[model samples]
Every structure is written in C-alpha cells, then in structure tokens.
Target chain A: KQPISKLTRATPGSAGLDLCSTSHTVLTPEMGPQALSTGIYGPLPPNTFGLILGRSSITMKGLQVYPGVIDNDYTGEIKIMAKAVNNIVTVSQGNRIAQLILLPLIETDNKVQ
Target chain B: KQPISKLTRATPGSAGLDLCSTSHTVLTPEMGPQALSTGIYGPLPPNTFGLILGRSSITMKGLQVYPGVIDNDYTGEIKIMAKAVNNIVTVSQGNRIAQLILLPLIETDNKVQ
Candidate 1:
C-alpha cells in the first residue's frame, strides 16, 4: 500500500516529504553508517525511486543521513542510513530524521554513448 | 551550454549521466564538506533539477559526494560536494567522480496543505 495518506508535505510545493523516526535512534562516532528503520511500508509508484536525504536541522547536529535510493518495487520498511561525525546523535521517536523525495525517472532510450 | 553531448549513460535504462572531474581534486579528513567544480554548465531542461549523487566506484574509495540538489534555474558550473573519511582522497582530471540524475518535478498546484 502506498504511504501517501500517512505522509504529508510541509507545503504544497515542497519537493520532499519529511520522514519521522519510529524509535529512539542513536548514532555514535564509531557507528559508521547505520540503517535505521522508519517503520513505514511502501511500494512506491512505478517510475519513481525514493531518495533518502538529510534534514538540514538533523544534519546540522552532525548526524548525516546518507542517500538510500529505494526502488519502486521495494515492499519492506524504508530504512534510512546515517552516521555521526563529531558527537553522539540521537532522535527520539516521532522526530524528523530524514526526508523522502520521489524522483521520477526520465525513462529514455539511451542511444548515444 | 547544456553539456548534454558530453554526458552519457552506461546503458539503455541507466538512471543517470556520469559526471567526471575536470581537475585533479583532492579531499583530506579535515576539509569537511568541500565543493569541487565539475566544469559542466547547465540550465537543465525546464521542470528538472540535477541530482548530484555518488558514484559507486568513487564512493568505495572513502570519498563520498553528498547529495547536491541543483535547482533548474542555476546556470553555472555544477559543483560536487565531497569529503574524505579514512585517508586523503584524490581524483585525477577526466575521471568519473559522481553521477548526475535529472529528476523532473511533478508540478502541482499548491492546494493541499
């Protein structure tokens, strides 16, 4: 099922949808890049891939969310990849950790090389 | 210039165009996030923005190009943001550094809030 109803854009013209954390997520300096579940299921519409990006507020805290490209056919919980650089990063449940941008593919016929 | 002729997809259904470095760029651990010029100019087709994403080959070297969301109206040299983690990362001139994925906006009227 599409999570369209569960997700809401901050504004009508916003490019992405804010994805909140489902649990108290934490990341330490040595954690490297970790994938935390969003507890949100999705089978994104065809021709689009879910682009997991960093939220400026969260990233400014040294918790960087690496891009996790999700294909349209994915049916599992959307996981967000993140890491800490300087200090421990924490996000309580129901807090915005990352943003999801649906990028529609160009769907072109590659002829030139 | 669009530089469309200079970019190419690896395969027919590839999602992005490969972007290579125009200079021998280097990144050190302390540099944090530095933006390197790709030397490609673009005012991408209307209704689209260039998604500066990491290339698998380059990212494997510990030099990750963070997500760079370039607006369509920006007509300037495309910059790629990168950082090093383990050691000094280097990319010689003309070497593939990142991939540019053009994402078309789903233009919608600002109705739902």
Candidate 2:
C-alpha cells in the first residue's frame, strides 16, 4: 500500500499538486541542467509510481524537465531536474517548479523469448 | 472512454509500451532538442492522458526527455522530444525511442477564491 505523508500546500488554489523548491538557484546556459529538491517525501503503492513533469510555461522558455520515475519503494524527498536549452534561468525558493502525477506501473514477467 | 487502437508490439517481453521513431535522426550537442514523431495515434479517456518518458539507459547518456502532456481529446501522432546535454545521440527508424504511460488528470474547480 502507498501513503503520501508530509504534504504541504503552498497555495490553496494551485493547479495540480505543487512542488516547491527548497533553495534558490540559477541555471546558466553553460552550466547545463541541475537537480533541485522539492522537500516532499512519500511512498507510492506497489506497482505504482510518480511522474515528475515540467510545467508547459517553463518549457517554452527553453528549460526542459528531465524524465523522472519514482519507484514504489522510494520514500525520499522528490527532486526535479531540468536543462536549459539556450538561456539562463532562476528558480526561487518556494517556487512551484514541477508537478507530480501518480501512475500505475506495468510489470511484465521475466521470461526469455 | 479511452480506447488504444493500432497498437503494435516490438517485442512481447518489453517492460513498458514502446514508442517507435518514424524516421532516423541524430541529436547533436549543438542542436539543442528536437521533436520526433512516434507514428502512433489514439484517443485517451476523459480526464486521462499519456506521459511520454525517456528510457533509463538513454537518459544516462546525457539525453533528457522533455516533459510532455497529452490531453484526453488529442488524437494525433505522439511525438517525443529530447535534449542532449553532453553527447550526440542517434535514433533509427523502428527504434524504441521512448515509453508511454497513461495518467489521470487532476481537474480542480474554476471558482476563484
């Protein structure tokens, strides 16, 4: 069974589940991409996981959210990573950086063909 | 209701649903990110969408899959986009370039507080 705990809301009217950044950082064009922490931790049910997705507005600015998959057994703070395509970006503390969507895992049997 | 049709499996033992590239291309470090077509189209159930994700092995090679969200009403060929952080990547026709996972949307009330 999965249970999400230590959940805190930055705003009451936020769309989707908001994930805040734990610190402020600048992503430079030459520095590539970096991973930031959300400070929210929880457990996903068996055969389930969370997809860390990028906000559409942010992606339009040339910052692409790296694909992330949270296994069912992971119970640590979620981190969001992104790479800048052609510009410098700043992420402030407590800013909504990414969105979390829960998904069911498709587990297949291990058999050699 | 969601109905996935014209589904073709590259292999029976694949971990997740495989998305194939419709053409061959190379992702150079200087090209930033490019979007490639998967050639698969279908309708998603209301309040549900597909999440296009990057393969773990490909991600480890400095190729980051950009965040993608498919709406329930979208019925077009799914495209996969990615950015190369530090290396050049090659994708061939019929290659498993990405994975697709279905997810439910979180629709909230529109009334402003």
Candidate 3:
C-alpha cells in the first residue's frame, strides 16, 4: 500500500441491494503502481472477506491500495473507506476514486462458535 | 496532513481508565476552517489519547481535519477510521461534527522495539 498525499475522496453507491456494499482502500508510505488494485485475503471460511480498489483518478497521484477477499455465506454489504497522510488536493466531481475490495466470509474447519 | 472527505466518523467512549482511552480524527480535502482542531503531539509517557471535537456537526461539508492525538503511554482504545469519495453522505447523531486536532505522541525516540 502506498501513502496517500492528498485528500481525494469517494463513496460506495447502490450495488444492487440498498444495503451498504463497499470496501476500504488501505495505503502505506511506500505505495507504488503495481499495488494500485490489489488486496490481502485471510482467515477463511464463514468469515471470508475481500478488498478492492476504487476508480478515483485524483487518488492516482501517489496512492497505493491493497484489496481484500470475502467468502460467500457472509451476510453484509461491502463497505469502502479511505485515509490520507500528507498534503492536500482537490477531488473533482464524478471521479471513480476509492477502490472496493470484497471481504467475503468463507467457511473453515475450525469449530467452537 | 490535510486530506479527507466523504465518509466521516469517530469514536472514544469512557475517559479515565478501563484504559481504552480516546481520539482519532485525520482527513484532508483542502479541509479548511483551521483544520477543525489541530492535532500534532509527540511521544508522551502516558496512555493518553484525545480527538476532542466529539460534538458532531454533520462534518463541515468539505472534509479537512488534523486535530487528534494519542498517548500519555499509548495503550489501547482511540481507534478512528473512515473512507470515501465522490457520492455517499448519510451521517447522523448529535452532529457536533468531527473536528478536534491534537495528535500528541510525545517522547518519540530511537528505541529498540
């Protein structure tokens, strides 16, 4: 994940169901281009999840992201979010910023609810 | 350190000591009005954390915050995170708004952690 330098923002729109379907964009101080739309999936099964990237152009400046993965059986709309850590910049209208990653809740072989 | 718009949010609850103290407000988007708060502490010896402006005021419209801090010792609590851009705004409750500035993490040294 690269570090965000400006304040370009975005939000998750109606993705079929009226629920909140979106993901968050994670950035680090050493962001790059290849990480523009990637994510890290973890601890699977009933609680699988995913992380994606937004289509915001203003964010293309010097920001990096790591998308996530989500499993089926999960009952929640993916929510997206962002954070900046440097200077300030203006985000124009209609910019497809803020990537979206799916954090699906997968089922694993670990018991004890 | 100014850049954040769209999705606005904050949290902190109990003050004194269950020890999970408070604070966390960082954004940018040309975020104006004196940065809402002005946080810039250094590395303290306590577990103190403060994001102050917990009043909630519909988030001053064009995101911009820097107020916020953490640590008299830096234990737990004080977890703030938000992300968004473009469309999507529906934050409610109290509305004093998110503007607090105070990132105090004093005593930052070259340690061997």
Candidate 4:
C-alpha cells in the first residue's frame, strides 16, 4: 500500500495521515494468484515465484504502511504499513491498499507451464 | 538437495538422496539476507527490492531444479534447481544447496535482477 500524507490530499486544512509516522506490515499474496514464467527467459524449471499485497491505510490526518518479501515456492497473505503526513490524522474506513505480482524463470529444456 | 528418502538413511542409506520421489530446486536469497520493516516505516523509499539465488543440484542419487521470483528491485544471482531427487540421484562432491535470505519487500516493489 502506498501512503501519502493527509496534507497532500485533495482536502484543504485537512491534516494528512502520517503514513510516515504509523506502522504497517508486509505480507505475501495467496497461492496460485499468478503463474511462474517458464520460457528460456523465464524462471528455471521446477521453481515458481510471486508476491502478496499487505494492509495499508491513508487517512485525513495520517497514513500507515508495512512492507515485506515473497520467496520461491512460497505462498501466503500480504500486509503493509505507512506513516502520516501531518499530526491531525483523520482516517475513515476502507483505507488499506496494496498489490501482488507473479514472475518465473524456466529451465532451458522446459516449456512454459 | 533436501531430498532424503534413500530407503531412509545410514549406509545403504548411502542412497540417501532424491529430494522427493524425483526433483530438487527453489530459489530466493541475496539482498540483505534479512531486514525491512517500516512503512509506518521500512520501505516507502523511492522504492527497493532484492533476490539472486538461481542454481542447484545433488549428485550420487540424482537431483535438479530451477526456480525464480524476487521482487522490489531484486539484487541478483544465487542460482538454484533440483529434480533427479531420485531418477538415479547421484550428484558428485560439492553439490549445490541454495540458500540466500535478504528478504526486504520495503515498498514491496518487485525488482530482482
């Protein structure tokens, strides 16, 4: 999730969330969310890779976020944290955000799967 | 080469290999080997990422594998893979046992070179 200071928001006098001040978590995405690449240019064979988005928040007063990594053959959830931009933080509901991606490296003799 | 079913292991266990009925490989490890946790701190940086372990093996019994995926501006090389885990698993001396661990997702970007 990306955190922007509440001060940076469209609201005026609205103190931005201190996403830079709060804390967040980084988590991995679920399994099979994406396919591992498999061409000569893809991940070697027998291996797979992906990432999970974590939780993050942006409020009128501040923001929060967290970050993390995903490994080969790994499958899990994702989370994140961020800081606030100002001190008068004002957060509402449904403010978290993040993303996930899948990449692969195949062996020379193997075909894309 | 975490394949050890050689009938089970000891001397005839010398057959002590094959990772999993047949195959061995998984990659990820390079950057900080560990570290990254802000967002309410860690990443939020302009952006960052890491990874680079790509290669593997196990002789005597047989094994091979190749896998990939390291995001957030991944660092680079640590080859990995394994499969013969059986099919006659018989890797010679100094077989490869991939293991890298610089897991910092920070912005959680997805950059592993």
Model 4 lDDT tens row, A1-113: 23111112324442221111123222122110111111112111134333322233333323322222233432222222222333433333333333333334221221111
- Whichever of 1 and 3 has more lDDT, that candidate is 1
Runs in model 3 deviating more than 4 A are A1-78, A82-113, B1-46, B51-61, B70-94, B99-113
Residue B65 Cα positional deviation in candidate 4, in Å, after optimal superposition: 30
Model-by-model lDDT, in order?
Answer: 0.75, 0.67, 0.29, 0.26
Would you estimate the TM-scores of all the predictions? 0.63, 0.58, 0.25, 0.23
Fnat for the candidates in order: 0.22, 0.17, 0.00, 0.00
lDDT head-to-head 2 vs 3, winner? 2
State how far residue B91 of model 2 sits from its true place (Å). Answer: 2.1
Per-model clash counts, in order, read 0, 0, 102, 117
Output the number of the TM-score-best candidate: 1
Q: What are the runs in model 4 whose C-alpha is more than 4 Å off?
A: A1-48, A52-64, A72-76, A83-91, A105-113, B1-113
| Residue B65 error, candidate 1, Å | 2.5
- Candidate 1 per-residue lDDT, tens place, A1-113, comes to 33734887889998888888777988887656666777777767778767778889899999987776655666777777777868998889888888888877676433445
- Which regions of candidate 1 deviate over 4 angstroms? A1-26, A30-44, A55-62, A71-79, A90-99, A108-113, B11-14, B56-61, B69-75, B92-95, B105-113
Tell me the interface RMSD of every candidate, in Å: 3.9, 6.6, 16.0, 18.0
TM-score of chain A of each: 0.87, 0.77, 0.34, 0.29
Task: Choose the strongest candidate by DockQ.
Answer: 1
